[PDB]
Amino acid sequence: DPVDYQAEDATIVQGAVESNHAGYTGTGFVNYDNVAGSSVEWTVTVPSAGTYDVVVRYANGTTTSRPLDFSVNGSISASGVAFGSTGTWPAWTTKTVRVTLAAGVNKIKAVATTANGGPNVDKITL
Ligand SMILES: [Ca+2]
Ligand SMILES: [Ca+2]
């Protein structure tokens, strides 16, 4: 139904696939490098054009938000989405971002806007 798209199987720019915090799904997660512009870009397929709720499963073991810009097929989707603390790195949490998609194959990209980089990201589901 909802379909999982694992971060570690996506296109990663300035990040690393890791597995040293428990509770991820798939074979690991992406640890964004601690730079602005680090990103993950998923290739997804949906049956019809329209709105989709993209459920981002992430962790942030710090008190500082790590915001992401989301874009869809190269156009901004959601700007400045905060990813706040989860207390600990294994405390994976979800946040929903609504992204407009075309029927069929689309790319969804989440890029870090601050020098902190992104939260750790397990997957998106939609
Ligand atoms: Ca990081
Ligand atoms: Ca994963």
Swiss-Prot record:
Domain annotation CBM6: ranges: 3-126
Top-level taxon of origin: Bacteria
Section of the entire sequence shown: 907 to 1032 of 1032
The name this protein goes by in its record: Exo-beta-D-glucosaminidase
Family: Belongs to the glycosyl hydrolase 2 family.
Coiled-coil stretches noted in the UniProt entry, renumbered to this chain: none
General function of this protein: Hydrolyzes chitosan and chitooligosaccharides with retention of anomeric configuration. Has maximum activity on chitotetraose, chitopentaose and their corresponding alcohols, with a slight decrease in the rate of hydrolysis on longer chains. Has no activity against beta-D-glucopyranoside, beta-D-xylopyranoside, beta-D-mannoside, beta-D-glucuronide, beta-D-galactoside, beta-D-N-acetylgalactosamide, beta-D-N-acetylglucosaminide and alpha-D-N-acetylglucosaminide.
Organism, as annotated: Amycolatopsis orientalis (Nocardia orientalis)
Cellular compartments annotated: Secreted
Subunit-level organization: Monomer.
Gene name, Swiss-Prot/TrEMBL: csxA
